[PDB]
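Q: Joint fold for the lines below.
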Amino acid sequence: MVEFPEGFVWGAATSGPQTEGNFHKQHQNVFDYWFATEPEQFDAGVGPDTASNFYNDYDHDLALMAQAGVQGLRTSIQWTRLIDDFETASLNADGVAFYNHVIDSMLAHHITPYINLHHFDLPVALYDKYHGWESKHVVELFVKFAEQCFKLFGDRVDHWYTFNEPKVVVDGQYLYGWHYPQVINGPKAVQVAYNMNLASAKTVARFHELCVRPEQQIGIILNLTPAYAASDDPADLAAAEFAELWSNNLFLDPAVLGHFPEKLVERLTMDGVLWDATPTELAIIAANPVDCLGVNYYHPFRVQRPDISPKSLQPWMPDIYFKEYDMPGRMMNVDRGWEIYPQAMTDIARNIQKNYGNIPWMISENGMGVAGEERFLDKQGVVQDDYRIDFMKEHLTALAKGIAAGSNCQGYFVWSGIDCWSWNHAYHNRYGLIRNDIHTQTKTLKKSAKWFAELGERNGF
Amino acid sequence: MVEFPEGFVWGAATSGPQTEGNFHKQHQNVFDYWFATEPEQFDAGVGPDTASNFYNDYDHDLALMAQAGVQGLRTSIQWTRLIDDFETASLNADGVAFYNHVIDSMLAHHITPYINLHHFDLPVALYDKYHGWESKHVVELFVKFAEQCFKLFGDRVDHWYTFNEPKVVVDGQYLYGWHYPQVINGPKAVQVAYNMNLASAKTVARFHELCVRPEQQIGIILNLTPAYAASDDPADLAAAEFAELWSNNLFLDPAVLGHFPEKLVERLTMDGVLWDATPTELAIIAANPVDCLGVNYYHPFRVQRPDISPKSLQPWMPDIYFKEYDMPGRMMNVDRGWEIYPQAMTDIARNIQKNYGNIPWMISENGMGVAGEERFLDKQGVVQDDYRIDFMKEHLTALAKGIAAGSNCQGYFVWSGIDCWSWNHAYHNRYGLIRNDIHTQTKTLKKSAKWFAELGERNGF
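A: Joint structure:
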């Protein structure tokens, strides 16, 4: 009744830092150091030190995912686990063997590997010495690590991503306190946004110098939630105009089009907060767009005019141009605080089709978190997460309309395969097709797991 | 008519245990303990205790070798002579002065030193306390002894080798009974082959930190005799392949390529006998391959299908995959029991050139042993060893063919310069350019010594 293109990929998504645990990891990333120093900042005091025990139990974990119908799995390689000395990108022998072990086990369980290079997990030592992503030297070090990933694992990994949602690194580390180091500074964030766009682009270049076969593609994962205007009031339309440029075009355009959006750069220049770029850097950015796009979507985003004029003297922030709006009558995931709006899936698909060349793209994240799922265990200990199935049906229906209108979407990756550790929220909200009892690290398919396996065999529902 | 590159090194090869005698040596190596304890295992009851008296006679001995055209002399430093306390690698003063004397005296007689670190001479104490090369602790203590050699003697030694033929130690000590302790255990022999390769690479690493000059080079001496198939029957072809991997690639590949042959480790894994390795160790082996390769060759090896299935119930041995074969019509060194086949010289050169990056290499051993050279003394007491001149001619002619085809061969070292003590065979067979009457320790050049001096002058023959 809803069916999908032949060859469509049914996947699941996570990341290294949210699954592995820190067993025998050489370097701390900012979240590791944050938890070691301020454990009260994490839900129920659970941090990343064990997470979902993937370091020790990867083989049986992937077998569970294979059962739940994961045809492709996307996760991340931790910089802080792979590299011995960051300056040289010398290899940690034990970390190299681990990722070999999980990739080979992925193939052995007939799971296609999708490898992201960075998922919010900057080595804290690089923040201490260079202030992290504010440093173009740190940009270069990232490329030397990416290069090592390609040479070690390129031989059996076809699908790569430079970054998961660099905007969340910019907002998290430099705007809103979400990530350690918790710096609050607009100008710095603007430079970090630039620097990560540049790092992503030099990585693609390096990747294209090292990639052999034509099946080898590299992309970027962005959240493409539209910024819907609260109303037709011109001030509200101007707020959406800027929120769209800042939250989506700031990364979409350089990655796909090769350039930053000109109206944004004009805005940042007038405000005196534009990044330091060089023409050589902008040229690399123009000449190495991504091969494909990963799109994350969970909940829509709406914007009205700001309470006060952006000319008011206040520290510069992108927020001086737009304020979040709560639509009366909205549909709500009440416990999570998120509006439900599958139509954005269709809007996103149209935007890519109309304005971004209909570049090959996938939904690389889509899912629904619920707290206390033990309340829905059946007799045999299987979570009855019909709500999670309803959520996928609604969004997959919206997706299919976008595809039917001609959008070049080639897969759908659920967040998440197994319940995983969600930064400071930890395991408050569960998203997986598979439950993790984190006290014993015992994992069990949910009802959605079976429905998703069946979805892949029918290629529809 | 047969001509050699400009700069070709014409040398001779021995070892410390085969020449020095045990005068004032602090520790027993395994052969020392074996003879003191079962002299009846030794030809004519002759052990290592006097050998060719090189401890006492080194200066005149080297005068004689210079007369024979020895341009470079390869020999070894004995672990059991140099080191006081093995755990510390503290120094025995007499031993330190002894090797300083011989190195200074090589230089004074215009003989280039080529110092090997290990020639079958494990300290018996280290076998009793740790079971020798089975112990990774013994591996580290060897690195300490190597370190001492490099600091004490590296100011006037440019050319070093880690080991002479680890395979003979594996075979002798752990598979076939040739060396005390005469263990006969397949799986231990596998662990020992690994451990010794690991000791070599850790030594190369330690050497490249303590080497200054650019002409200081460290290599390893292997026997690269090809494993010729008895026939083109697929079973015989299969026996030769494993024979090749086991006898040659087991050491040639980690030493030069930085890794063990995939098909061999696949076989050892399947058979349940693979060594215990760590990722960190494997990385040390991958990062520290040799600068040079010393190549020993004496006589060919031919191989046929084993008589019974390798799946038969029997203790694991490499030999379950191959049986030696005698070819009808072979050219024989009848008394010694060895086939003569100089074409193998060309075959080794081709293999190094084609599959091992044409790494700098030398024939580090080639020669012919003959018993009862008294029968061939001329009226002035000079061995008329024309058979040894012929043997060298045939093998140099084949070597020249390998060089002309483009193989990076840089020297030819005769085994031996002076008749030396050949383990359990003691002095039964003589290899020298120079005779030793071992009763009086009186040395006398043979005819082949004169030929060898002309050879070095013409740079050919």
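Q: Anything notable?
A: Chain A has 14 helices and 15 strands. The first helix of chain A runs from residue 30 to 37.
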